[PDB]
Design an enzyme around this catalytic site. Structure first.
Site, short mmCIF file in Angstrom:
data_model
loop_
_atom_site.label_atom_id
_atom_site.label_comp_id
_atom_site.label_asym_id
_atom_site.label_seq_id
_atom_site.Cartn_x
_atom_site.Cartn_y
_atom_site.Cartn_z
N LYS A 94 0.84 -1.19 0.00
CA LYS A 94 0.00 0.00 0.00
C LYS A 94 0.88 1.24 0.00
O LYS A 94 2.06 1.17 0.32
CB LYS A 94 -0.90 0.01 1.24
CG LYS A 94 -0.06 0.10 2.51
CD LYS A 94 -0.90 -0.18 3.76
CE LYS A 94 -0.03 -0.04 5.01
NZ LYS A 94 -0.71 -0.53 6.22
N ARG A 150 -9.43 0.85 15.77
CA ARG A 150 -9.34 1.63 14.54
C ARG A 150 -10.43 1.13 13.58
O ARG A 150 -11.43 1.81 13.37
CB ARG A 150 -7.98 1.46 13.89
CG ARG A 150 -7.89 2.41 12.69
CD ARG A 150 -6.96 1.82 11.64
NE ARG A 150 -5.58 2.05 11.69
CZ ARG A 150 -4.54 1.30 11.40
NH1 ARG A 150 -4.52 0.01 11.04
NH2 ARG A 150 -3.43 1.99 11.56
N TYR A 153 17.18 29.73 5.28
CA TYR A 153 16.06 30.49 5.80
C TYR A 153 16.09 30.59 7.32
O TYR A 153 16.39 29.61 8.01
CB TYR A 153 14.74 29.85 5.37
CG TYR A 153 14.46 29.89 3.87
CD1 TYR A 153 14.36 31.10 3.18
CD2 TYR A 153 14.23 28.71 3.16
CE1 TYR A 153 14.03 31.13 1.81
CE2 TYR A 153 13.89 28.73 1.79
CZ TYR A 153 13.80 29.94 1.13
OH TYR A 153 13.46 29.96 -0.21
N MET A 169 12.58 23.69 0.08
CA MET A 169 11.70 22.90 -0.79
C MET A 169 12.47 22.08 -1.84
O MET A 169 12.12 20.94 -2.14
CB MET A 169 10.70 23.83 -1.49
CG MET A 169 9.65 23.05 -2.30
SD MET A 169 8.36 24.09 -3.08
CE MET A 169 7.60 24.84 -1.69
C1 LIG Z 1 10.92 29.04 -4.58
C2 LIG Z 1 11.53 30.41 -4.61
C3 LIG Z 1 10.62 31.52 -4.75
C4 LIG Z 1 9.16 31.67 -4.27
O1 LIG Z 1 9.03 31.63 -2.78
P1 LIG Z 1 7.85 31.78 -1.88
O2 LIG Z 1 8.33 31.94 -0.45
O3 LIG Z 1 6.80 30.61 -1.99
O4 LIG Z 1 7.23 33.09 -2.28
C5 LIG Z 1 11.09 32.72 -5.38
N1 LIG Z 1 12.42 32.79 -5.73
C6 LIG Z 1 13.37 31.77 -5.53
C7 LIG Z 1 14.85 32.03 -5.77
C8 LIG Z 1 12.89 30.50 -4.95
O5 LIG Z 1 13.83 29.41 -4.91
C1 LIG Z 2 -0.10 -1.62 6.48
C2 LIG Z 2 -0.63 -2.80 7.20
C3 LIG Z 2 0.26 -3.90 7.33
C4 LIG Z 2 1.83 -3.84 7.39
O1 LIG Z 2 2.52 -3.33 8.64
P1 LIG Z 2 3.93 -3.11 8.87
O2 LIG Z 2 4.13 -2.71 10.33
O3 LIG Z 2 4.50 -2.02 7.91
O4 LIG Z 2 4.48 -4.45 8.49
C5 LIG Z 2 -0.31 -5.17 7.65
N1 LIG Z 2 -1.66 -5.20 7.88
C6 LIG Z 2 -2.55 -4.14 7.83
C7 LIG Z 2 -3.98 -4.28 8.26
C8 LIG Z 2 -2.02 -2.88 7.46
O5 LIG Z 2 -2.97 -1.81 7.35
#
Ligand SMILES: *Cc1c(COP(=O)(O)O)cnc(C)c1O
Ligand SMILES: *Cc1c(COP(=O)(O)O)cnc(C)c1O
Lengths: 359, 359
Positions: free
Chosen positions: B34, B129, B255, B303
């Site tokens: 999954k 759950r 930043y 990012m």
């Molecule tokens: C990604 C980035 C942006 C835009 O930034 P925001 O904080 O989402 O406004 C603008 N200029 C550069 C150089 C970036 O890497």
């Molecule tokens: C995702 C899930 C698993 C696997 O669990 P792990 O801890 O990653 O092995 C098995 N059974 C169900 C019901 C799950 O939702």
């Protein structure tokens, strides 16, 4: 679909581009759509904004994913190109590029291209991430004006490291350095992104680069939202309940039985988890909208499911609409409750999430 | 150049399925794939394990995407179906399903299908759950054995909430409840996932459901890796440097000025950020391999980029190989350093990350 879905409001997107032109009236717009347009969809976000002066991307791959989809506006490679063998594509695709290192400059110097390329010299004015340092910038700049491979004039770009913190002098210092270097030089100037646009009108210059605020989300962590600036939220992370079960007092929920109920109640299970991009860090109590009514997350967020406390006679049922954020719930509220940056919340989503576009 | 890429070792994947057959020798295997196979790729992970007795998915969408890719094996819908109108597809596609609520059961009861469907009644033994509670389980179970649309016998499934905490009696209690309900009933029994498989041999029963450990990663938070159980890591998150710059003492990075250098040094910039799925929460000091040599992250993770401290005369240069986690750097180690669950680290990656398969 009724499970993990991101609904993108195209109308709010257009409103924001226009609203930003009102806030920075003497500057052209570089719509920043890197990282799948901040989780909204790279190509669809570009197609929604045919009015954008240009588009900004992090990588070359993104820029051609745009040309492949038919996007024709100028695309700005914010980090430049990573391989000299890319210059021929970049020239032919009419991509504009940043130039921050020796490798890129030397590449431009000795390449043979059918057309010159428009360039933005990246100047490090304080962020200390990418860019030519002040003491090396004048010589580096001069070599670019001597390139016949570079379309004159050489433009100048830079980025703020702390524009969202108006009471430290970081921004004024970068601006001071930016201004000193640009004196007497032709070519467009650009240093402002979302923060610079909203809080520093003296940094607008020729081009501003709106990113996060273009999607109607706030750039700062002072719990303000995009609506504080007249910008409308574009994304809605939605899903549905897949179960409504009885629960009793003293009984725990989720991995690590980490929430324990103090009353008999009914729990709802949402088809949403971190396998979709929802923060696993979300603490119990984080807000979710179920049938347009706010309920708290109880227990640890799993890979595919999230449990919420509905109430002992809550009449919600499997199949009912759930909003992780969106209309009754700005992503900024979820960032304050989870302590996760709104930038990361909207961007770090997986390919499991379906994409809808409205308006 | 190479940017954000996940390299999947098909050989290690194979090794782990067998190794798990050695740990649970009397149980069949439900390979849990999954959430895009925990970030490794839903279809490719299935195609790498044609030996798996069955495949487990969270949602119907994922199972259908397996059939679309040519996967022919039985697929287990771990959360069942969310709409009664899905039964005909489930029946025709030969999907096995869990049944945890009234809606699903009532659907089974009045549907008209060309073929009956294999079912696993989900019993809530403590996780609270999904699943039928003990005091409603006997009546619910009996209705399933009376369904014409259910292929007899009715199988019984459940899941552990705290199997990774051997000192609390949570698991023994769920096992006690599971065992009491299964007494005298035919049909397969299944309650163990990664934790139950490794730490609780009493819970293996007929079918075990390996998820995380199938990918060579540890289900626990006890500084154990997959190698502690003879399982080999399948994923490596890799990238490359896009810049190596000079930096000076007293100067901050990234930043918020989150990091300030105490010495003149050289900083490397990695083509990796949270727009790819790398945790924005990663603190300065988090390990990353540059040319095979561990260096620390300095400053906030952006990012699209991550800065690392290479050293004043470090000879690394733009284009050189970087490993975020992989061989030399288990994802567990990164989880410990960043405090982010290994489950989320490998799974919450974006579509920006390229996929490579070796062996
Ligand atoms: C990604 C980035 C942006 C835009 O930034 P925001 O904080 O989402 O406004 C603008 N200029 C550069 C150089 C970036 O890497
Ligand atoms: C995702 C899930 C698993 C696997 O669990 P792990 O801890 O990653 O092995 C098995 N059974 C169900 C019901 C799950 O939702």
């Amino acid at each position: 679909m009724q499970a993990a879905t991101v609904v993108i409001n195209r109308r709010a997107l257009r409103h924001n581009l226009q609203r930003l032109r009102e806030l920075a009236p003497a500057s052209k717009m570089v719509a920043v759509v890197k990282a799948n347009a901040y989780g909204h969809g790279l190509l669809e976000t570009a197609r929604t904004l045919p009015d954008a002066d240009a588009f900004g991307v992090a990588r070359l791959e993104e820029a051609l994913r745009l040309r492949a989809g038919g996007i024709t506006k100028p695309v700005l490679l914010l980090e430049g190109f990573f391989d000299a063998r890319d210059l021929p594509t970049i020239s032919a695709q009419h991509f504009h590029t940043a130039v921050h290192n020796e490798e890129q400059l030397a590449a431009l110097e000795e390449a043979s291209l059918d057309e010159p390329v428009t360039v933005w010299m990246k100047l490090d004015t304080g962020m200390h991430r990418l860019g030519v340092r002040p003491e090396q910038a004048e010589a580096f700049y001069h070599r670019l004006t001597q390139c016949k491979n570079v379309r004159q004039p050489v433009n100048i770009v830079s980025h703020f490291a702390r524009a969202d913190e108006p009471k430290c002098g970081a921004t004024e210092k970068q601006l001071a350095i930016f201004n000193t270097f640009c004196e007497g030089k032709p070519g467009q100037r650009s240093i402002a992104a979302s923060g610079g646009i909203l809080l520093w009108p003296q940094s607008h210059f020729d081009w501003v680069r709106p990113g996060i605020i273009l999607y109607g989300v706030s750039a700062l962590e002072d719990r303000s939202t995009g609506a504080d600036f007249g910008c409308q939220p574009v994304m809605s992370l939605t899903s549905s309940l897949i179960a409504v079960r009885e629960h009793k007092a003293g009984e725990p929920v989720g991995y690590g039985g980490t929430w324990v109920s103090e009353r008999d109640t009914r729990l709802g299970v949402v088809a949403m988890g971190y396998g979709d991009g929802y923060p696993r860090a979300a603490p119990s109590g984080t807000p979710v909208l179920v049938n347009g009514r706010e309920v708290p997350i109880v227990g640890r967020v799993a890979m595919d499911m999230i449990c919420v406390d509905l109430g002992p006679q809550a009449q919600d049922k499997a199949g009912d609409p759930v909003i992780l954020w969106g209309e009754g719930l700005p992503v900024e509220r979820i960032a304050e409750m989870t302590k996760v940056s709104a930038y990361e919340l909207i961007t770090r989503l997986t390919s499991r999430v379906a994409m809808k576009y409205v308006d």
